[PDB]
Amino acid sequence: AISIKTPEDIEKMRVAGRLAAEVLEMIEPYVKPGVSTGELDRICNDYIVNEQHAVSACLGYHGYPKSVCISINEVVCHGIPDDAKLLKDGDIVNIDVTVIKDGFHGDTSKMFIVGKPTIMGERLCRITQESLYLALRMVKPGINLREIGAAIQKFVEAEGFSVVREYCGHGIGRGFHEEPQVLHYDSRETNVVLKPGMTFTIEPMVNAGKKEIRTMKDGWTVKTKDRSLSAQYEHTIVVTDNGCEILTLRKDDTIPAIISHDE
């Protein structure tokens, strides 16, 4: 039961996706040693509401208390912005932005490396982004999502890293999470043949160590069981007649927005 967006809906998703990307471009100069994640979230929320005239989709969702998710180092996902949590040299930090504009969602995330990188953090982030990019290059009508998940997993595991099983990409539109699920690993349960006009995210979570995760007592924060680093990147796309179009591209992305597989 996957919805096919009309041309007009796709345009609304271009607008919302651009906004989500622009939050990430806006926040970059503030992501520096010494800043708190609480401050970063306030800057993002003020921007979303006062400048973009949009709404955070995370705020209040299942009771989530903040406007963007900010996850550092061994935190896998859903980290909660906190005025007492300060960024420091060598940290890897995901900021995940999901906004609603004119009824439609845009959803994206990226890693930031704070100050002087660690080589392992830089490698983990790079491989994670590359795994997203290889998946994006596969998207076209007639391909199965299973093939995409399997390919992400093979690539990541060859680097000695692992793919988190509990979270996945998703259909997106008027709802935050819509059909289909987009698993970043191979499953016999996956059988989804892509069609033009489907809109969904790809967003692998990749651990440097083992795949297993743990949720903290705060009921939100997810960490690697082994306290290894974890990284994630996310884009929202639309399937096109000949490939896909990335709706959340930033200037710092190094893949084209429009990917075509025709001659």
Ligand X SMILES: N=C1N=NC(N)=C1/N=N/c1cccc(C(=O)O)c1
Which amino acids are annotated as binding site for substrate, given as ranges? 78, 98, 177
Smallest gap from residue 77 Cβ to Co ion (A): 9
Closest distance of CB 203 from Co ion, Å: 5
Q: What is the amino acid identity at position 248?
A: T
Which pairing describes strands 222-224 and 205-207: parallel, antiparallel, or unpaired? unpaired
CB atoms under 10 Å from CB of 262, counted, come to 7
By CB under 6 A, which span of 28-36, 59-67, 117-125, 188-196 interacts with ligand X? 59-67
Residue placing its CB nearer to ligand X in the complex, 77 or 116: 77
Residues 127-166 close enough to bind ligand X by CB under 6 A:
none
145-158 helix and 119-138 helix, angle to the nearest 10 degrees: 160
Query: Buried b / exposed e across 26-48, counting CB within 10 Å, b at 16+?
Result: bbeeebeeebbbbbbbbbbbebb
Binds ligand X by CB under 6 A, chosen from 91, 96, 245, 253: 96
Q: Residue 253 interacts with Co ion (CB under 5 A)?
A: no
109-135: buried (b, 16+ CB within 10 Å) or exposed (e) per residue? bbbbbbeeeeeebebbbebbbbbbbbb
- Considering only 67, 71, 201, 232, the residue that binds Co ion (CB under 5 A) is 201
Stretch that binds ligand X, among 25-33, 58-66, 153-161, 250-258 (CB under 6 A): 58-66
Task: Tell me the site size for ligand X, rule CB under 6 A.
Answer: 11
Stretch that binds ligand X, among 14-22, 60-68, 141-149, 210-218 (CB under 6 A): 60-68
Q: From the annotation, which residues make up the binding site?
A: 78, 96, 98, 107, 170, 177, 203, 234
Asked if the bond preceding 141 is cis, omega within 30° of 0, the reply is no
Q: Does 98 bind ligand X (CB under 6 A)?
A: yes
Query: Does residue number 62 form part of the binding site for ligand X (CB under 6 A)?
Result: yes
**Gaps in the chain with C–N over 2.5 Å, residue before each:** none
- Residue pair 45/67 in contact (Cβ under 8 Å)? The answer is yes
d(CA 116, CA 12): 39
* 168-169-174 Cα angle (round to 5): 130
Binding residue for ligand X (CB under 6 A) from 107, 178, 245, 253? 107
Strand partners, 162: 207
Give the x-and-dash track for 111-130 against ligand X (CB under 6 A).
Answer: --------------------
Binding site for Co ion (CB under 5 A): 96, 98, 107, 109, 201, 234
Binding site for ligand X (CB under 6 A): 58, 61-62, 64, 69, 78, 96, 98, 107, 170, 203
